[PDB]
Amino acid sequence: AMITGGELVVRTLIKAGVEHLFGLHGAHIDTIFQACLDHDVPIIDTRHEAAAGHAAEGYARAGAKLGVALVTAGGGFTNAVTPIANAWLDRTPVLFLTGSGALRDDETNTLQAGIDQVAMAAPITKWAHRVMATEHIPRLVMQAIRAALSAPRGPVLLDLPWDILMNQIDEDSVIIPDLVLSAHGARPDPADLDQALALLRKAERPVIVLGSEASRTARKTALSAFVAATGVPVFADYEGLSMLSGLPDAMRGGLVQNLYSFAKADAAPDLVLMLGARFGLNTGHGSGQLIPHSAQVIQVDPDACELGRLQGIALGIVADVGGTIEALAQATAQDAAWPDRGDWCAKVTDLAQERYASIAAKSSSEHALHPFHASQVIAKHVDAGVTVVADGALTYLWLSEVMSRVKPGGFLCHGYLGSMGVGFGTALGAQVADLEAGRRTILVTGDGSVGYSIGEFDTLVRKQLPLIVIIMNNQSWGATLHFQQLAVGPNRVTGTRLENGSYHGVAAAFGADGYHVDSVESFSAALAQALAHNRPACINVAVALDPIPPEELI
Amino acid sequence: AMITGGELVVRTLIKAGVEHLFGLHGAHIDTIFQACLDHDVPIIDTRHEAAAGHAAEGYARAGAKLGVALVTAGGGFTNAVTPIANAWLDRTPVLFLTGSGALRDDETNTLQAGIDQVAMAAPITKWAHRVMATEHIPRLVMQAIRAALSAPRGPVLLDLPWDILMNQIDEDSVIIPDLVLSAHGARPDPADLDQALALLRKAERPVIVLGSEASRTARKTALSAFVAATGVPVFADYEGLSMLSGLPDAMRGGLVQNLYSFAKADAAPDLVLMLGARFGLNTGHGSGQLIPHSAQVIQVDPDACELGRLQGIALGIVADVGGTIEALAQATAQDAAWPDRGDWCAKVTDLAQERYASIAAKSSSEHALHPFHASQVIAKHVDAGVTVVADGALTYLWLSEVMSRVKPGGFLCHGYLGSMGVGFGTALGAQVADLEAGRRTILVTGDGSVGYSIGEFDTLVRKQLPLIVIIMNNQSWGATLHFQQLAVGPNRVTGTRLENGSYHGVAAAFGADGYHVDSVESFSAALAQALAHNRPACINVAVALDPIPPEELI
Amino acid sequence: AMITGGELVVRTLIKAGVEHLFGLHGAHIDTIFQACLDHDVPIIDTRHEAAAGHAAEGYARAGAKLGVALVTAGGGFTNAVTPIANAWLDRTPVLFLTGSGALRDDETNTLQAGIDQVAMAAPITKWAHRVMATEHIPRLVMQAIRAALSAPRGPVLLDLPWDILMNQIDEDSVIIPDLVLSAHGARPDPADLDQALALLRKAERPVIVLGSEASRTARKTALSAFVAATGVPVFADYEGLSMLSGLPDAMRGGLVQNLYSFAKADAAPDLVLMLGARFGLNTGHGSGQLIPHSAQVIQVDPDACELGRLQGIALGIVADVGGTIEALAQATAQDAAWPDRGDWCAKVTDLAQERYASIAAKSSSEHALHPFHASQVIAKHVDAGVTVVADGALTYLWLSEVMSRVKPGGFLCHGYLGSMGVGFGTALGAQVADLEAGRRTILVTGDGSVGYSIGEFDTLVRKQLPLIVIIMNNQSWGATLHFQQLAVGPNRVTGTRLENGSYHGVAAAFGADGYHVDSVESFSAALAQALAHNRPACINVAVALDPIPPEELI
Numbered sequence A, B, C: 001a002m003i004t005g006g007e008l009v010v011r012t013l014i015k016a017g018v019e020h021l022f023g024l025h026g027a028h029i030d031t032i033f034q035a036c037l038d039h040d041v042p043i044i045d046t047r048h049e050a051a052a053g054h055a056a057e058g059y060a061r062a063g064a065k066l067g068v069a070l071v072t073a074g075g076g077f078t079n080a081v082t083p084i085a086n087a088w089l090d091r092t093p094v095l096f097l098t099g100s101g102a103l104r105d106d107e108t109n110t111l112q113a114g115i116d117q118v119a120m121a122a123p124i125t126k127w128a129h130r131v132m133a134t135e136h137i138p139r140l141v142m143q144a145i146r147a148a149l150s151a152p153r154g155p156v157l158l159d160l161p162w163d164i165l166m167n168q169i170d171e172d173s174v175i176i177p178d179l180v181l182s183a184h185g186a187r188p189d190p191a192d193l194d195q196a197l198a199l200l201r202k203a204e205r206p207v208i209v210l211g212s213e214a215s216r217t218a219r220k221t222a223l224s225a226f227v228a229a230t231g232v233p234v235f236a237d238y239e240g241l242s243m244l245s246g247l248p249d250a251m252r253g254g255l256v257q258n259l260y261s262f263a264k265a266d267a268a269p270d271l272v273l274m275l276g277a278r279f280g281l282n283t284g285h286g287s288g289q290l291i292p293h294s295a296q297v298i299q300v301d302p303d304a305c306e307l308g309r310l311q312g313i314a315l316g317i318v319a320d321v322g323g324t325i326e327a328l329a330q331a332t333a334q335d336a337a338w339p340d341r342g343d344w345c346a347k348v349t350d351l352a353q354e355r356y357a358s359i360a361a362k363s364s365s366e367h368a369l370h371p372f373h374a375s376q377v378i379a380k381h382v383d384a385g386v387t388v389v390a391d392g393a394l395t396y397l398w399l400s401e402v403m404s405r406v407k408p409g410g411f412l413c414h415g416y417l418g419s420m421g422v423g424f425g426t427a428l429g430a431q432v433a434d435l436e437a438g439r440r441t442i443l444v445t446g447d448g449s450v451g452y453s454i455g456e457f458d459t460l461v462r463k464q465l466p467l468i469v470i471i472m473n474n475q476s477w478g479a480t481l482h483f484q485q486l487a488v489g490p491n492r493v494t495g496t497r498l499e500n501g502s503y504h505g506v507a508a509a510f511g512a513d514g515y516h517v518d519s520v521e522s523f524s525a526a527l528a529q530a531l532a533h534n535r536p537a538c539i540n541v542a543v544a545l546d547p548i549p550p551e552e553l554i
């Protein structure tokens, strides 16, 4: 009946519904490991704390739920900082649990103690705090979880000293609370909703744009009923893309990027409904190249700061994105008198197809495999039973041109942080979530980026996670090499070439299946063979460097 | 005449005497790359910003000079944080140069912008600041350098926005300053020095202990004259060890750890002179197991906080360690009437040898290679022309038992942060410095730890750096597995085994020479063959897990 | 044998030699108040925490020793922040002790809890920390004291939770340490000192400039011997001025400001020795108006960052200022062969006297009392037995013109923070220190500034502290009004007039003697009568607004 602080943590996690953790062992946090072992909660242990943190992200992003990461004092915490920052700008819900030096023997120059871990995380978390008494563990763990899961989602840090964790108390003297927090988000005032719907009804070329908060709550059947009653076409940023997979084809606009050529075609949108999509990198900042200056904008976001930050808007609503979608479907089931919109949907469709065909007529694979042709080979395997993870600059810019006409189960790309390497860990976490849902995970990364976490091939084999890692190999840090040539001069390249190393050989030495290909025919056969086996694999693809993707010109 | 902000940075670095930089490219910092190319200043580009950071540390520590790291905005900075924290606790002088988002278009949700990089670094740097005008670059770069190099040494962060760097100005309108800062440290008041020397003269069993600040200034000929005149035996922590290599053998006490058994032998030190060695992990905290409670203590440190932080002292002096050593030599050349001390030195010598012989009589290699026997094989190659770098827990605890009786050119081990993985990058940086001095670098690391940065084998081959990487392979995260068995129970091991992967195969796929050995004879032949070639190499050593090193009991 | 955490604090303060505290009561810190009552250590309780903090500053500045301030949780701490910031930029040694919410019942939304007080103080202290265990109180109090007192001096924050203070332990189980820290500062390398002295010997027009670090250590007899042997004239900023009071008249240059007119007179200094004086506001930034671009500069400062921050220098030394002065005296006693310098001292003297006479010939008091004439009246009472405190903008700029030819026991003016109002509390603390030394304190302040802390007249009467408060009353926030007229237009004055209120009437209602005067004759009689009484007093002086002081043009 006497129990440890580590037990208290794990009993609270169970009551909150968590089924998996991601981490790397240390003596400071061993009480949490022992408690998980007793209760049959698995911990996926990696080869780097960074990979563990990004895996918690991937699990959250692919499964639309909470992720949990577990690291030790000192370097255990500092190795987790890139994942924390990435989750902060992507609005993704992760609980980071960290060890730290004992409170008794504070300030004694001892092993792994002495860095102010809370101060380091303050600028990049929704909340960050250090626990002062063992009795407080259940209430504070649950409080941290409530902060992460509410709108807008984001990362939280709970710091647990090695004192506080090893301490033993009477289990009968401290209660474990339930997670009591409504699953339904708040919705707009009925007067704001009426105004929004009247604007939508009288528009000639209306458009919808989804962002990350739409993916976090995943209100698919409501979104479907709303789109079916109004006939309004829908676009998304990277993180919102998979929310379009269940819509009828005639209302699928794709990624926001191909709103670019609408102006030069006399087809600039009339009105745009932004649901959780911010003014920023993915939406063309304040330039008006995608969201026109002449259009009327309705914006819905849980954070008032974002409402028209870079551009004038017509109506600004603070509410939950899922709750709003839900309210739009309800009003629109009573209503049911909506103008046709068949011609406008055809126009949206025709413009996207024009971009695609234009790219295709310019891509050649004589004497070297073109990046666009390589992307096309992946695309024919993409559907509801697949999660796609994208890393590596030039690689994902080319890949995005084939992503609009297919319907992925999940799509996970870079956000605002834009940091090379986060892909490997992200994909590993996603595959853990996809197994319970019956789906396959595929990572598409660059030859530069894969090096950040190449050790994780060992983890894939140890844990038997059948992830497929595809490397687009152009012998260089690609986008950065392009910058030097384009912005400085043809003979001004330094520190950007990578003309060495057999990546498939490295995976083989760790016990995973390795392939090397260099054409449409060989790549096609290798991918089909990898999908047919229930095992991890590495496919090393020789690809040309010279071609410039349309998005790089912007 | 018209020049960029990047040009200004590089012209100032040259005038300060810097000859090498360590980094990873980004478009945000390209102006610094171009300027280095024009001036013939090499940039060593790695596969991870963490490895670049630790390389700057290694260059500084092995060469007794300034280290310089160079990283891009966003993830470039966040990937550098473990190196920054490590340098902070180790008191090592590194200038961290980082990019950031442009000041114009601040707060626009754009690529790689938005994280408060200065706030993140504040708790772990001597100084941290963001540059506001291109004109300020020379004076601020030089100010950052002065902060890093003065006592006690430490890391500094200079944040340079991509605005401020691309900007062009008239070279005639801003002046580049010299580095004007005395090379000699401040020294004690003559009355304090007299008091210290009178205490030393009347002691029966005096002892000296050196810390990191002795290595940073490297006053070797002065230390030699002082020890030769007084006959007082000298000990050191890990970072101070190489400062003992030029002393006569009769006054070499070795690492502080073997002061442990002095009390049970009626030989507890009478008086101890601490020169830059703090009360903390390496010196036994406040327990009195190494620095006795009954001894009189003289402490010299540039930070008043450290003076008797965990224990009562007799005399507390704030001054520079190098300046103090220099002042002790000068007073002791005039003086020259010192008591014998021959018997006491013999006693110190005999106790260290007793420890060694006791370990040796207990180590067996029947059916598996013993970690102590493997350390012995390395030891016969260690002298003035070699730098040894140590990573990986159980590995370095065993290795330390053979380090006192040899005389290394350099020795680089974990400090207070105690973070697995920092070794690979550290060793890479050290080898760059050793080349100009004509020395070889050897890294000794664990099978767990090597995985953190295994991609750097590629960098070794690309740059032709002949570093030898030795992996002590016990199929596990060793020390942590020991904790579970010893502190919880024999059947309570989880998350600590690593029974997969061919590490020598991985190095071979990156283009480096790979060996696998499992006995005294085979390991011996492989190491000799690797030293005979001017090329990088990996030696994978199968070693037993069960033996417990003496230090792990403490 | 059972004692409280509050007892532990006070027992440690006594052993460190503190004899007075400054504060304001709260229930959270009552254990400290009870302990002071048992041990006969007085606490000076004010009417505002800001006045308590500035009183700790004044006690430290006027007595050349440690100041100690005591405040309660929440608003107790936040009311103390202006004092903390002021001490940070002035390099003044104050220990700030603050209460905070109990660690048990952390994070319960309770009275005065919840603000991160350590994070608020981090950017403006040398050290700031929160105590985690009652046992740690003695070692951490003493550590805080060592940090405040070493070079360069500054403020420190120790946060003591209400939990940790009320807790009782066995007095026999925790030891109270001594304060063991040398009273002598570190000194330059003999080679740097020789170089400095050879430069000084061959100069034609050398000059010395003192700053705050010279006042903190107060090495008067050493300074006197050095100046007497070399014949080199000495200047100072506001904080260094009182260190000139014991020098022979022929070598007294005065405040650095009157180095201004030397260039137009063909007398620009040849060489300047800066002892703790920084490049900044008081020394003319990097403009070369006071410290010439053509001169050779030797700079001595404990912080390497300051060494030539805004201008090229010839020799840069990191050492203690007191230790350096001491070393200069010693070398100069053996030496004794120094060139005359009689002509050059006469030139320095003649230039200062020229400025004074020029001001005097321009000041008229027909129809209103001129600020210069009012300053002259105060000057005839200033000598070794008096401390002068200066506040309020136009007031202190006029006052400074009479300060060079007199020899004050102390002089306390604004530093870099330049914040109106800090004077009243500063003066109150100085008078506490002056009583044990047998000196009188006089505050000279503006009609705007006195309003910040006018309630302290009550404290003066309650405690019987015979401070004289003189108010220069020009019916306005003066310097700011001048700015509007001079920089914007004659009819652009708003928010700067203060044409209401009887300040002498307010002091009388609090029980202090009140006078009102408006001419040379009346002011003269009132001040003489106030000095003749052992009692606090307020003298309200009607003065003209229109005149512009020389320093305001700069």
Ligand SMILES: Cc1ncc(C[n+]2csc(CCOP(=O)(O)OP(=O)(O)O)c2C)c(N)n1
Residues within 6 Å of the ligand: A391, A392, A393, A394, A395, A418, A419, A420, A421, A445, A446, A447, A448, A449, A450, A472, A474, A476, A477, A478, A479, A480, B024, B025, B026, B027, B072, B075, B076, B079
């Ligand atoms: C952590 C980090 N370091 C550096 C950069 C700067 N950078 C922009 S793209 C790029 C590399 C792309 O290389 P690779 O992964 O091979 O993809 P490719 O463009 O060659 O397809 C680099 C270095 C970054 N975004 N993040």
Ligand SMILES: Cc1ncc(C[n+]2csc(CCOP(=O)(O)OP(=O)(O)O)c2C)c(N)n1
Residues within 6 Å of the ligand: A024, A025, A026, A027, A072, A075, A076, A079, B391, B392, B393, B394, B395, B396, B418, B419, B420, B421, B445, B446, B447, B448, B449, B450, B472, B474, B476, B477, B478, B479, B480
């Ligand atoms: C960054 C970091 N530092 C420290 C730890 C905790 N830790 C203490 S020893 C150890 C690992 C030892 O493994 P290896 O590198 O093979 O050396 P061995 O002890 O097996 O010789 C770990 C993980 C951690 N988990 N992460």
Ligand SMILES: Cc1ncc(C[n+]2csc(CCOP(=O)(O)OP(=O)(O)O)c2C)c(N)n1
Residues within 6 Å of the ligand: C391, C392, C393, C394, C395, C396, C418, C419, C420, C421, C445, C446, C447, C448, C449, C450, C472, C474, C476, C477, C478, C479, C480
């Ligand atoms: C706390 C603070 N508030 C405001 C200011 C701006 N300020 C500079 S001079 C001045 C006021 C001068 O008023 P007074 O005390 O009457 O002195 P006078 O100039 O009339 O001699 C003010 C308000 C400041 N420096 N600090």
Ligand SMILES: [Mg+2]
Residues within 6 Å of the ligand: A446, A447, A448, A472, A473, A474, A475, A476, A477, A478
């Ligand atoms: Mg590439």
Ligand SMILES: [Mg+2]
Residues within 6 Å of the ligand: B446, B447, B448, B472, B473, B474, B475, B476, B477, B478
């Ligand atoms: Mg191991």
Ligand SMILES: [Mg+2]
Residues within 6 Å of the ligand: C446, C447, C448, C472, C473, C474, C475, C476, C477, C478
């Ligand atoms: Mg006024």
